[PDB]
Subunit: 187 residues, 2 copies
């Protein structure tokens, strides 16, 4: 939260980009906290992968990472769910080169593809990643993570986008079902 | 923020409605804070109009108010702006029975209507209210508040929805320009 707020203010200052010239003093002022609080937050955010910090001749740059953006997209998706705001998505890209029983029971399908999404659809993919989708339970064997399943359509044929719950930041999505491509994804 | 989080958790617990059975103990648990912290937050939120608290034979009910919802819609609109997510709106209702120089300069129009929006479009109106719109500066004469102006269209004719920046919770909107009705509103 004070962390959410710091990430949000940094992205806000980054304006259209994902980079901002910010000192701990300036960020402290934007946030209404002490310089020391701000310094500590920046260190924590950087050590834990939400931002990177780069010292240049022109000043210090705070860059939000894929993980830092995921914090904002997850909050957006939480509020969409809670306020019942519909935020379904289209992503385009290129086709590229225990769970099963749940796919059957929860998605009511018999499991049998890989898609490299375009850089220009990366913001839409990031949006999707913030949502919860259909929960598919992880388990112990090694502990296997839960996955998220998003009902989707390719050429009006239904399928699901499958993702680890512990988000991995990649431009490659996996689709399970019962060349350029367009996928509508239902959040 | 700890306040944002408490409002958000309360609305989340309210599920589809705007009411939740919650004790300070239960809310403390949901929030990861002490019972005493939770008690203090509930009191503050209630005294300041974000929630109401009602003691019944069935338990304590925390109800989110129009103002409490505005906190969530404002956060949603902040994230839409910051992440460049488009959230334009249609609202329907019924037609019902110093600033000027800025309307001219900022909206590039010559100012010359009132609409009672339907209960079913109230969620869309609430969404609009979270956005900033075009800023029209307040001033001193009495201090007059700033207003927000949202480009809009009725029957494909452009106009603006005008609102005080200090949100007022009403189902009546005012439109300025150069029976049932449908208004598209651009956030």
């Amino acid at each position: 939260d004070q962390y959410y707020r710091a990430i949000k203010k940094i992205k806000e200052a980054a304006e259209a980009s994902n980079r901002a010239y910010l000192t701990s003093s300036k960020l402290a002022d934007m946030l209404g906290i002490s310089q020391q609080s701000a310094s500590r937050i920046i260190i924590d955010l950087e050590k834990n992968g939400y931002i990177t910090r780069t010292v240049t001749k022109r000043g210090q740059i705070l860059n939000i990472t894929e993980k830092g953006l995921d914090v904002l997209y997850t909050e957006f998706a939480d509020l969409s769910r809670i306020l019942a705001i519909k935020n379904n998505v289209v992503i385009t890209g290129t086709v590229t080169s225990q769970y099963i029983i749940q796919f059957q029971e929860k998605l009511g399908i018999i499991p049998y593809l890989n898609i490299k999404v375009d850089q220009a659809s990366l913001p839409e993919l990031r949006k999707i990643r913030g949502f919860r989708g259909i929960h598919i339970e992880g388990f112990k064997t090694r502990t296997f993570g839960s996955v998220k399943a998003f009902p989707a359509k390719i050429q009006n044929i239904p399928c699901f986008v499958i993702m680890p719950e512990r988000t991995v930041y990649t431009d490659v999505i996996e689709i399970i079902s019962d060349d350029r491509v367009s996928v509508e994804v239902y959040t």
